[PDB]
Design a protein around this ligand. Structure first.
Ligand SMILES: C[C@@H]1COc2c(N3CCN(C)CC3)c(F)cc3c(=O)c(C(=O)O)cn1c23
Lengths: 125, 126
């Protein structure tokens, strides 16, 4: 029935490339510049979804988010470029004044603690 | 016979002429030795530290660009693993994932990096 467009079936959204085949386990750069993903059943991704070992975050419209994003009073940072969540890493502040540290589980360290070894190796908790 | 396919040492500095005899100038070159080289506007081969297109690089006495950690004048620096460009004002992971190393804006390693943490969690490194 559908073709080359988002299609809502039984309360769920799917996408049918310009040939009548619904995308399953497939990313797609929509005509709106946003990125969408469809799981094995063709369903449009919504919310935090893990795809190929990398975590992503889609809003309620199914559009992938990038950059800082708040999720239940806690921040995360999805690669401004690729969208994949960053973890155990330092992200430079917007005004290049400093850095924010993302714990190994994606969450922002509101209060990161450092300890410097004699050679300068920085360990964070 | 004009020079072709070789590094030519002309009274003083080093140069390189490709197979058609062109003198490489203001451009890189990946030699048959797996090394990258760079030449002046005058085609002189690069030695030591060179700033090329707003990025720093380090070549050995022989012109070969270096990558990774290099100690220069008793202080450590970190050249990109592939790119080779000198990293600065950034944190590099140690080879064993244990922690990190901070490279100052001037490229040098930080012995005693000083930390400051804002209320929201913003980190400042002196
Ligand atoms: C595709 C590549 C790879 O290598 C290059 C380089 N560099 C090669 C050396 N590395 C360390 C930095 C990139 C460059 F600076 C400019 C050009 C460049 O200008 C060019 C071109 O065709 O015009 C082609 N090449 C170029």
């Amino acid at each position: 029935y559908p073709k080359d467009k988002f299609e809502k079936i039984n309360g769920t959204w799917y996408y049918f490339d310009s040939s009548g085949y619904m995308l399953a386990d497939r990313w797609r750069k929509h005509t709106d510049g946003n990125w969408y993903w469809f799981d094995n059943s063709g369903e449009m991704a919504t919310g935090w979804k893990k795809i190929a070992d990398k975590w992503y975050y889609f809003n309620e419209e199914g559009a992938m988010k990038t950059g800082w994003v708040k999720y239940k009073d806690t921040w995360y940072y999805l690669d401004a470029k690729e969208g994949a969540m960053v973890s155990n890493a330092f992200i430079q502040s917007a005004d290049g004044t400093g850095w924010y540290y993302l714990k190994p589980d994606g969450t922002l360290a509101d209060r990161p603690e450092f300890t410097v070894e004699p050679d300068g190796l920085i360990t964070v908790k």
